[PDB]
Design a protein around this ligand. Sequence first.
Ligand code: ATP
Ligand code: ATP
Ligand code: ZN
Ligand code: ZN
Lengths: 394, 393
Amino acid sequence: ISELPIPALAAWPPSHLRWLHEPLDPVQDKAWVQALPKVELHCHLGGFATHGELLHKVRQEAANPESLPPVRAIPLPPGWPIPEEPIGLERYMRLGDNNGSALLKDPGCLRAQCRLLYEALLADHVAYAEIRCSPANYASASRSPWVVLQEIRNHFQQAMEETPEDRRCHVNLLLTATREEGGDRSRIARHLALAITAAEHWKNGCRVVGVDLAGFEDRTTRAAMFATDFEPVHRVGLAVTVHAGENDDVEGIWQAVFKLSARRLGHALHLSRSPDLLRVVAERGIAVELCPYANLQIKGFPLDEEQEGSETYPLRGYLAAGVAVTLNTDNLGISQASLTDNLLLTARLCPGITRLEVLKTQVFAAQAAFANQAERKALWARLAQVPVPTDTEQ
Amino acid sequence: ISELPIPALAAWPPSHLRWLHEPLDPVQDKAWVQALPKVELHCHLGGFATHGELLHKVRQEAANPESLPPVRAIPLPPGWPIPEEPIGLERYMRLGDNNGSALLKDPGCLRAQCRLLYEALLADHVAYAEIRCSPANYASASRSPWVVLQEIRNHFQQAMEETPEDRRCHVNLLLTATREEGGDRSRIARHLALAITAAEHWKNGCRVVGVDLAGFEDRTTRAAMFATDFEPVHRVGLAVTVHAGENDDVEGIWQAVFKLSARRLGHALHLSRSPDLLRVVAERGIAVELCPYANLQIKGFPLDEEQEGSETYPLRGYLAAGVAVTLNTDNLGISQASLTDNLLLTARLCPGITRLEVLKTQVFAAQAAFANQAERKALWARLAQVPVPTDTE
Ligand SMILES: Nc1ncnc2c1ncn2[C@@H]1O[C@H](COP(=O)(O)OP(=O)(O)OP(=O)(O)O)[C@@H](O)[C@H]1O
Ligand SMILES: Nc1ncnc2c1ncn2[C@@H]1O[C@H](COP(=O)(O)OP(=O)(O)OP(=O)(O)O)[C@@H](O)[C@H]1O
Ligand SMILES: [Zn+2]
Ligand SMILES: [Zn+2]
């Protein structure tokens, strides 16, 4: 009874505890996961409303209809959101080209983008969310990166107050310090200085809690970030996550843990290959952020297999090894899947994934979130309200 | 009830749950604290038997009795274990000199030091212990520091194997860079190469799990530590622990976390006066090792107060701030107190400390231990068996 992730599970009757240990059903437990309080740690602001009906809602409320770009032709791959074959990362970023840099530069569009995304987290029962944005991408000749960040913060801080404290999601912001291919270390300096300033401007409500080192790949300009000077970042309270995408080495991961002092790892799908790194990543507490849909589409994994094969999703292996694994959505729009579909696609990606392990990935995320003491106790008190099962008759 | 540390406490009757939240009593709770499955993270091998009956049980086992040095007369202060005035740190170390490097160069005395200490951990109901030692301090012209360490390891492993699994204390070894370091980078290089080699020799039973950078408290050896590459230590899997304490050098602790990648801080008593550093130490999980008796005897703290002041023992503040705080013995011999007596003294150091806060320091210690997945899965299964209270009210 001392292996349950939350203390409230121990106070259940044996009928339900026996139910927690059976495999998750991706066709019947759709309603139990939905009511579950989730925790999002990898969500990109500029990828929420990329195509469909939400893209029109964002483009409709623009403050400069004349400035809005035309909606270019972005055809989704067939079988979407489960493509016939993977599409890659470069070809995956382009599906969200109807929204982002060239759309959200409109102050009006940014309001709907930040307010429609909060309504998508609330609908999903998210209790905590770290949103990732690049304010320097949405700036113009009259709106500096600090002005855009001011707006983004208060757009989420406004939605957070118009919501009852019982169902209120808590949104925090991560500044994606992108390793620009075309931009130089000037871009990094501005990004790291913007987070250090924001990391002390706000102490309550929406806060800038860390920096996301996207572009950690490209081990040719190695690294323009391992020069670092990240010590100011560490002394102001900020936390570092490395967006280890599009790469299959282990040396970068080693240097992110011990030179960058990173606390989370993004899309670290090849950790089991090196068991020495896997043991360190599990004893130091480093958290691994996995995105089921975004990974099945960029990389592609076997679906509905009946055995843990060689090329299977590493979620179950990570859990066995002790790694603190979390499940996220990456791009809500670009992947067309909410935080519930991703936790339900796990049943088909990892054969045998128990529905108790789902609660473990949520308890892990609750410990890997860059929240403060007040924010944690409010998050812990909301995951303690785990809903009771739906179908236990067999 | 989400605040309960141990999932097993959720299954207690509502009558007892209120008992936990009541303040601890350093007298009537002895039987309950004495039976708690405890975790030891700061215990020195060379400070176990410095005086008394134990000091002679060790000397009476040396293979070369004639080689034993004469038993000096070390006068313990009056009041001891609880002095009416602190004796400083340098006096504290000299207080134990009938044991340690001078005595434990004999294979017979060393064998009786690693087995009498294991009997003190069992008598105290310890389920996990990390013991720190300096093999190079006990080496002779014919006994290499690796020969000493290989003997120390097998004395504990042979003691652990002879005890039933359900009552067995798991002992792990930390290699300590002695406080007299920095002089030569040759000795800190032989020290880190011994741990990298030991961290691969043994993968089961008693293991070398980390290195303890003592002397960090000094400035001429803290730069030698910052000039030495610790990267090979991190790749092997060894963890790093640093001694804080008398030196209230905030800059030292900052660099020990982000340069040496330290996971634990020893005697970090001045963290509250640095609110910025107390947030990083409380959000990253860095654990703080506190020694209630070794801290009352080296620094001195108010006892039996009624309400918090401005200089009381910071264990209450640390816990509120979210810091992961552990309680240990430091030197079990030099201080006449076991792990049970250090937990009970917190009731006098910290006014109003709750019986649930005591059980938290043992869950914090369990998460701070440098044990692996197998060791951890067996330590949780022993902390979950928390004894039920005696009176209940
Ligand atoms: N999968 C990924 N791999 C690498 N970098 C990524 C990835 N996803 C996002 N990024 C980085 O995040 C930065 C911010 O992207 P975001 O999704 O917030 O929208 P955006 O800046 O409006 O988009 P874009 O530049 O594609 O039009 C991008 O510039 C890119 O550097
Ligand atoms: N409070 C402390 N602060 C700093 N260093 C300490 C403290 N207590 C012990 N040490 C260091 O711990 C190291 C190991 O001490 P231990 O108790 O194991 O005895 P020892 O070194 O074998 O004994 P001896 O000093 O008789 O040779 C010593 O080198 C000492 O420098
Ligand atoms: Zn991403
Ligand atoms: Zn010590």
